[PDB]
Design brief:
The protein contains 26 helices and 48 strands. The protein is of the alpha+beta class. It folds into 5 domains: about 1-140, Immunoglobulin-like; about 140-245, Sandwich (Immunoglobulin-like), CATH 2.60.40; about 245-365, Sandwich (Immunoglobulin-like); about 365-945, Glycosidases (TIM Barrel), CATH 3.20.20; about 945-1054, Golgi alpha-mannosidase II (Immunoglobulin-like), CATH 2.60.40.1180. It binds a molecule of 7 linked components (GLC-GLC-GLC-GLC-GLC-GLC-GLC) and calcium ion (5 copies).
C-alpha cells in the first residue's frame, strides 16, 4: 500500500540486431546486467572461442588457439554485443564458448544446431546455458517465471534460495490467471510480503534436504486456503523494484501442515453407508469438484457439485443406495503447476474399488456383497500360520505370474488361460503340479502385480496373443504390415507357429525370433505389470470379463482355490513407489491430476516429477499418500484376505512410513507379514529410508542379495565375458573353473562366507570363521564394501537364487558352468544352488519354475518379452531353453558370449525336469521336516547354528552347517533328534567328513526314502561315524534322540 512497485526493467523487449546471411551464423549476447543501465560495460574484452573437429564441423576457419582473444564482437547496441560467424555449409552445427577474455560466462561447451534454429541466428545470455531463437526469448526467459525452487513448507514458512539477501521478497497469487507483468510491465496481482527469518527445527525435521535454504516468513494471518486455490509465484527484487528472479512454488509442505490433520480423520472413495452412498475425494487445491454419474453404457446421468470441507480440503456428496453399481468420475477444476493452467478434466477415483474395462471409469461397489464373494469366502482360513518368528521362518515362496502359470497349458480350458480362474482347473497340469509342490512344503504363492496395471489394454479386441492367427497380429498392430514379417499376414499360421519356424535360422547375426516378438510385445496381453493405474482394484485383463465387478469375484475365487484346494498362503507384489504417469495430460495420470504436485516426488529446483524408480516417483513421505497406501493395504488385507505384501523398491519409502503402515495392518490382522526389495534409493537426504540396514530389528523383511550373488556368481550389472567368468558357489567357483574365469581360492572362499552367513540367516551379530580362519561377526563379512550380515532375526531376511527379474538360475548356470559339466551335473548344480536357500535359516523365496530348470533363452529382463520367453511348460517337454536370442536392446551386448556358451550340453527334457522336480520336493520337505531349520529368533540361531570346514585350509565348496537340539541350547525343539547336520558338497570331488566320528549320525529319513533319486544318493554313514559325500550332492543327517535329551552339537564360543 506503501510498497515499492515490483516491475520489469523499463526497456522494450529487444528485437534482433542482425540476421545471418548465407554461409553464416549469428550469436547474440544479451547483456541483461547491463540493460538495467549505468555502465555501458565495454564489450571489447568480450570474445568467442570457436572450434570444430568432432561432433560439430560447420565453422569455416575456427581460431583453435584457446588463448587467442581476437574473436571479438562484430557490433553492438544497447542490448549487448553480437557475432557474425562464417560457415562451410550452413546445414549442421557449431561449437562455441563465450568468454570475457580467457574467463568465461556460460558453464558449458554450448552448441548451436542448425536443425533447430534454421536461420542460424541464436541468442544466449551470461550464466544461462540455453540457446534461444531470438533475443526476445532470451530476454523473456531472463525476466520470466522459471523453475520451482520455492517451497511453501508450512503455513508461515517459505524456503527459497532466490530471495536470499534481497530487499523485496513476496509471494504473488492469481486465482484464475498466470501471474505475469502488466501492460505497464509491472506485477499487479495481489501478494503477501515475506520477512527474512531462520528456519525452525520442526521444519528442519520435516525437510532436512531443504534445511540449508534461506527461510522466509508470512504474516500470521495470511489466508492460506485462498492462495492454494490458484497459482502462487515467489518473486524477489532489488531496491528499485526491478525483478531479480521469480519461480513457481512447491506447496506439498503447506498442504500437509494445513489439511492433513483434518483429512486423515476421513474415509475416501465411494462408500456404501446405510444412508446410501457417500463419495469423498481429497482435493485441497481444487476450485470445483463435481461428481459425474454414468449409465451402464457410459452416458452422463447426473452431475453433482460436491461439498468442500474447509478444514480437510476434501470434497463429499451423499447419494442414494441405488448408486450401487454406477460408474463415476470426479470432474475437476484445478490449477496444475506443470501446465500453469486451471485444468478441467474427468478423473477416476484414486480410491476406486471397481472399474470399467481398461479403467476408464470407477464404479461404486460394496466389497462385502455376497454377490462378489465365492461360496464360503468368509470362512477362508490361513492354511499356514504366521504368528511367531518360527511360523514366519517356515515361509517358502513361489513367485508366480498369472500368464506364466496358464498361458501355455493346453490342459487349462482355453477361456481360462492367462486368467485368475486358471487356478480352479483342478485337473490341469499346472494346478496339480502346484498341489504337489504344496504337498512337499512350498507354502506361499507370491503374485506378480494383480492390482490394476496400466500396460495391458483390457479391450480384448485391441490385443493379439501368440496363440492366435498372425493375421490378427497384423489387424491390431499396424507396425507389422511395415516390417520384415509382413508376408505372414496371409500365411494362415499362428504367431506361435511363426515364432517356432523362426528358431531354425535364428542366431546372433540373425536375431529374428526376438525381432518378431518385439512387435508382438506391443499388443499382446503380457506384462509383469509394475505400472500402477489404480492401487486397489484387481487387474481387469486377468478376468474373463473386465467390465465391472466380475473381476472382483473371479479374483477371490482364485484366492480361495490357492488357500483351500492348493493349501498355500498368498502374497501380493505391490508398487506404491511410483505411478504410471503424472501431469494433466496422460490417460493413466490419476493422483497428479486431482492434487497436482502433492503425490509425486519433485526435484527441489525444477519441480519436475522424478523418475529414479523408472517412471513417476511417488512421494510416500507425504501424509495423505501414506494414508492412501495404508487404506489400500487394508482393503487387500480385509476384503481380499491377502496374507502378506512385497513392496517393490521399498527403499524409496521412509522407514517410519512402512512401520506406520504395518501397525495399521497389524491392528486389523496381527499376523500379516511385510517385506520388500531395495538397493539404490539415494533418498537418505530426505528421510530415513526403508533399507536393509535401517530395518534391522523392526520385523520388516528384505530380500538379501548376499547369498544370491554368492551362489549365482557375479552381480546384476555383469555383461559379456563377466557373465561367464563370475562363477558362483552353485556353478563351481574355484573348484570346477571354466576356461575364462580367474577366481582365486580366496575369492571362492569369500563367496562361501557369504553363503554360510546367509544360511544362518544373514544376521549382523552371528559369529563365524571366515576365509582366513579369523573370527568375524556377520556385520564384519564384506559385501561389496558393506556389512554382509544386517538382520536381527532370520525372519528379516529373504534368501533366493532366482527371481522374476534378471537371468533365471538355469541360465546363469549355463553362462558359467565349465564345458566338462554335463547336463546331469548342471541339474544338480541347480539343486545345490537352491539347497543353500531351502535348507537355510532365512525365509525361502524362489522363482516359479526353478523346479523345472526354467530358462528364458538368456533373457535378463523379460517384463515385456511375452508368452514366448517366459513360457513354463507344465507338460514337461523342455525348460524353454534355446528358443531364440534374447532381446537385442537389453541383451545384445551378450550375444557373443551366448552363442559361445549356449550349446555346451543338450536342452533339458522330461527326464531332467522330472529329476529336478524331485530334487526340489526333497529339499522343501527337508526344510519343514524339523523345527531346527526354522528357528525364527536370531538369538536362537546364534545359540544353536554353527559351521564346520571353516578357515583358510577348508575343503573348497563344502558347506557344513550344524543345528543343535542338545543341552547347550535349551529345550529339545525336536522330540526326534538332538541335532542336525546339513552338508552341501558343491564340488567335483567326493569328500569325507570326520567331524562326527563315532557319534551315531545318520542320513535323514526323507533322503533315504528317495533312493538313488535323492540328492544324497551314494552318501555312506560308516559305523565309526565318518560320512562320505559324493560330488555335487546335498545330505541332511540327524543325531537320534534317546529316552531323554542328549548332548547334540554344541556351538563353540569363538
Ligand atoms: O537399480 C540398480 C540395481 O540395483 C540392485 O543391484 C545392487 C546390488 O544388489 C548390490 O550388490 C550392489 O551392486 C554392486 C554389484 O553387485 C557389483 O557387481 C558392483 O557393480 C559394479 C560392476 O561390477 C561394474 O561393472 C560397474 O557397473 C557398470 C556396468 O558394468 C555397466 O554396464 C552399467 O550398468 C548398467 C547395466 O549393465 C545394466 O544391466 C543396467 O542395470 C540394471 C540392472 O541390471 C537391473 O537389474 C536393475 O539393477 C538393479 C538390480 O536388480 C539390483 O539387484 O536396474 C539396473 C538399471 O540401471 O543399467 C546399468 C546402468 O547403465 O554401469 C555400471 C556403472 O557402475 O560398476 C558397478 C558399480 O560399482 O558393485 C555394485 C555397487 O552398485 O548395489 C546395487 C545397487 O545398484
Ligand atoms: Ca533466430
Ligand atoms: Ca489394468
Ligand atoms: Ca506386452
Ligand atoms: Ca533426490
Ligand atoms: Ca531334541
Amino acid at each position: 500500500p506503501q510498497d515499492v512497485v515490483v516491475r520489469l526493467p523499463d526497456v522494450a523487449v529487444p528485437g534482433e540486431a542482425v540476421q545471418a546471411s548465407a554461409r553464416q551464423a549469428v550469436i547474440h549476447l544479451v547483456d541483461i546486467a547491463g540493460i538495467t543501465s549505468s555502465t555501458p560495460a565495454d564489450y571489447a574484452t568480450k570474445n568467442l572461442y570457436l572450434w570444430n573437429n568432432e561432433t560439430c564441423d560447420a565453422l569455416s576457419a575456427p581460431v583453435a588457439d584457446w588463448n587467442d582473444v581476437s574473436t571479438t564482437p562484430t557490433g553492438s547496441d544497447k542490448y549487448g554485443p553480437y557475432w557474425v560467424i562464417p560457415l562451410t555449409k550452413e546445414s549442421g552445427c557449431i561449437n562455441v564458448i563465450v568468454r570475457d577474455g580467457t574467463n568465461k560466462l556460460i558453464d558449458s561447451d554450448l552448441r548451436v544446431s542448425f536443425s533447430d534454429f534454421t536461420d542460424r541466428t541464436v541468442s544466449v545470455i551470461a550464466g544461462n546455458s540455453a540457446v534461444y531463437d531470438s533475443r526476445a526469448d532470451a530476454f523473456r526467459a531472463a525476466f520470466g517465471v522459471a523453475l520451482a525452487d520455492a517451497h511453501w513448507v508450512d503455513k508461515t514458512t517459505l524456503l527459497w534460495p532466490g530471495g536470499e539477501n534481497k530487499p523485496i521478497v513476496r509471494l504473488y497469487y492469481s486465482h484464475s490467471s498466470k501471474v505475469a507483468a502488466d501492460s505497464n510491465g509491472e506485477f499487479s496481482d495481489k501478494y503477501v510480503k515475506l520477512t527474512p527469518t531462520t528456519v525452525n527445527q520442526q521444519v528442519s525435521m520435516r525437510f532436512p534436504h531443504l534445511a540449508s535454504y534461506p527461510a522466509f516468513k508470512l504474516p500470521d494471518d495470511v489466508n492460506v486456503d485462498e492462495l492454494l486455490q490458484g497459482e502462487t509465484v515467489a518473486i524477489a527484487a532489488e531496491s528499485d523494484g526491478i525483478l531479480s528472479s521469480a519461480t513457481q512454488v512447491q506447496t506439498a509442505g503447506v498442504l500437509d501442515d494445513t489439511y492433513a490433520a483434518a483429512a486423515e480423520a476421513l474415509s475416501y472413495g465411494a462408500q456404501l453407508t446405510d444412508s446410501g452412498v457417500t463419495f469423498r475425494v481429497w482435493a485441497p487445491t481444487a476450485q470445483q469438484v463435481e461428481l459425474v454419474i454414468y449409465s451402464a453404457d457410459k452416458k452422463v446421468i447426473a452431475s453433482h457439485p460436491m461439498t468442500r470441507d474447509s478444514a480437510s480440503g476434501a470434497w463429499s456428496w451423499q447419494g442414494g443406495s441405488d448408486l450401487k453399481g454406477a460408474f463415476y468420475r470426479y470432474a475437476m477444476t484445478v490449477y496444475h503447476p506443470q501446465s500453469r493452467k486451471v485444468e478441467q478434466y474427468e478423473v477416476t477415483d484414486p480410491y476406486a474399488h471397481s472399474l470399467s474395462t481398461n479403467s476408464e471409469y470407477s464404479q461404486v461397489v460394496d466389497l462385502n456383497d455376497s454377490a462378489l464373494k465365492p461360496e464360503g469366502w468368509d470362512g477362508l482360513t490361513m492354511p499356514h500360520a504366521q504368528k511367531t518368528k518360527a511360523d514366519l521362518a517356515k515361509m517358502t515362496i513361489h513367485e508366480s505370474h498369472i500368464r506364466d502359470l496358464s498361458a501355455w497349458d493346453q490342459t487349462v480350458p482355453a477361456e481360462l488361460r492367462g486368467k485368475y480362474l486358471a487356478l480352479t482347473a483342478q485337473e490341469s497340469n499346472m494346478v496339480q503340479h502346484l498341489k504337489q509342490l504344496s504337498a512337499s512344503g512350498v507354502t506361499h504363492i507370491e503374485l506378480l502385480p494383480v492390482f490394476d496395471l496400466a500396460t495391458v489394454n483390457e479391450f480384448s479386441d485391441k490385443v493379439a496373443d501368440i496363440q492366435q492367427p498372425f493375421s490378427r497380429l497384423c489387424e491390431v498392430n499396424s507396425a507389422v504390415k511395415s516390417s520384415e514379417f509382413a508376408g505372414y499376414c496371409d500365411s494362415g499360421s499362428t504367431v506361435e507357429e511363426v515364432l517356432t519356424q523362426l528358431k531354425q535360422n535364428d542366431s546372433k547375426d540373425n536375431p529374428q525370433v526376438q525381432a518378431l516378438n518385439t512387435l508382438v510385445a506391443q499388443t499382446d496381453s503380457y506384462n509383469w505389470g509394475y505400472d500402477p493405474f489404480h492401487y486397489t482394484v484387481p487387474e481387469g485383463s486377468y478376468a474373463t470379463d473386465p467390465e465391472g465387478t466380475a473381476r472382483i469375484k473371479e479374483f477371490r475365487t482364485m484366492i480361495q482355490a490357492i488357500k483351500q484346494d492348493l493349501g498355500m498362503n498368498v502374497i501380493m507384489d505391490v508398487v506404491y513407489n511410483h505411478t504410471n504417469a503424472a501431469g494433466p495430460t496422460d490417460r493413466t495420470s490419476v493422483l497428479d491430476k486431482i492434487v497436482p504436485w502433492y503425490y509425486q516426488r519433485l526435484n527441489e529446483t525444477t519441480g519436475s516429477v522424478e523418475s529414479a524408480t523408472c517412471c513417476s516417483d511417488s512421494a510416500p513421505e507425504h501424509r495423505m499418500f501414506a494414508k492412501l497406501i495404508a487404506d489400500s493395504l487394508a482393503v487387500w488385507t480385509t476384503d481380499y484376505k491377502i496374507d502378506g505384501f512385497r513392496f517393490d523398491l521399498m527403499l524409496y519409502h521412509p522407514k517410519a512410513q512402512i512401520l506406520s503402515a504395518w501397525e495399521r495392518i497389524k491392528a486389523l490382522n496381527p499376523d500379516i507379514y511385510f517385506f520388500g526389495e531395495g538397493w539404490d534409493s539415494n533418498q537418505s537426504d530426505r528421510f530415513e529410508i526403508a533399507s536393509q540396514i535401517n530395518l534391522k530389528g523392526t520385523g520388516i523383511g528384505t530380500f538379501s542379495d548376499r547369498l544370491r550373488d554368492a551362489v549365482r556368481g557375479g552381480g546384476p550389472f555383469d555383461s559379456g565375458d563377466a557373465l561367464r567368468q563370475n562363477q558362483g558357489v552353485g556353478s563351481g567357483a574355484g573348484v570346477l573353473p571354466n576356461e575364462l574365469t580367474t577366481l582365486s581360492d580366496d575369492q571362492a572362499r569369500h563367496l562361501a562366507d557369504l553363503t554360510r552367513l546367509g544360511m544362518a540367516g544373514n544376521l549382523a551379530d552371528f559369529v563365524l570363521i571366515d576365509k582366513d580362519g579369523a573370527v568375524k561377526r556377520g556385520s564384519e563379512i564384506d559385501y561389496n564394501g558393506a556389512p554382509g550380515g544386517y538382520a536381527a532375526d532370520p525372519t528379516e531376511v529373504v534368501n533366493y537364487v532366482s527371481k522374476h527379474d534378471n537371468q533365471t538360475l538355469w541360465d546363469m548356470i549355463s553362462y558359467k558352468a565349465a564345458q566338462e559339466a554335463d547336463l546331469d551335473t548342471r541339474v544338480r548344480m541347480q539343486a545345490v544352488s537352491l539347497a543353500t536357500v531351502m535348507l537355510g535359516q532365512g525365509i525361502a523365496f524362489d522363482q516359479q519354475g526353478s523346479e523345472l530348470l526354467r530358462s528364458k533363452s538368456f533373457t535378463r529382463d523379460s517384463y515385456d518379452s511375452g508368452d514366448w520367453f517366459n513360457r513354463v511348460d507344465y507338460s514337461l517337454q523342455d525348460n524353454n531353453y534355446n528358443v531364440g536370442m534374447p532381446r537385442s536392446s537389453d541383451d545384445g551386448s551378450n550375444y557373443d558370449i551366448i552363442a559361445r556358451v549356449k550349446d555346451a550340453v543338450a536342452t533339458p527334457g522330461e527326464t531332467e525336469l522330472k529329476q529336478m522336480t524331485a530334487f526340489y520336493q526333497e529339499l522343501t520337505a527337508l526344510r519343514k521336516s524339523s523345527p531346527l531349520f526354522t528357528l525364527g529368533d536370531g538369538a536362537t540361531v546364534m545359540k544353536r547354528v554353527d559351521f564346520r570346514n571353516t578357515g583358510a585350509d577348508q575343503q573348497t565348496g563344502l558347506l557344513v552347517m550344524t543345528i543343535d537340539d542338545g543341552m547347550q541350547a535349551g529345550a529339545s525343539l525336536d522330540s526326534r533328534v538332538d541335532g542336525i547336520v546339513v552338508a552341501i558338497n558343491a564340488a567335483p570331488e567326493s569328500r569325507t567328513l570326520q567331524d562326527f566320528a563315532g557319534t551315531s549320525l545318520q542320513l535323514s529319513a526323507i533322503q533315504q526314502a528317495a533312493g538313488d533319486r535323492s540328492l544324497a544318493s551314494g552318501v555312506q554313514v560308516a559305523a565309526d561315524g565318518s560320512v562320505t559325500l559324493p560330488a555335487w550332492s546335498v545330505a541332511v543327517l540327524e543325531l537320534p534322540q534317546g529316552e531323554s535329551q542328549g548332548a547334540g552339537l554344541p556351538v563353540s564360543s569363538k
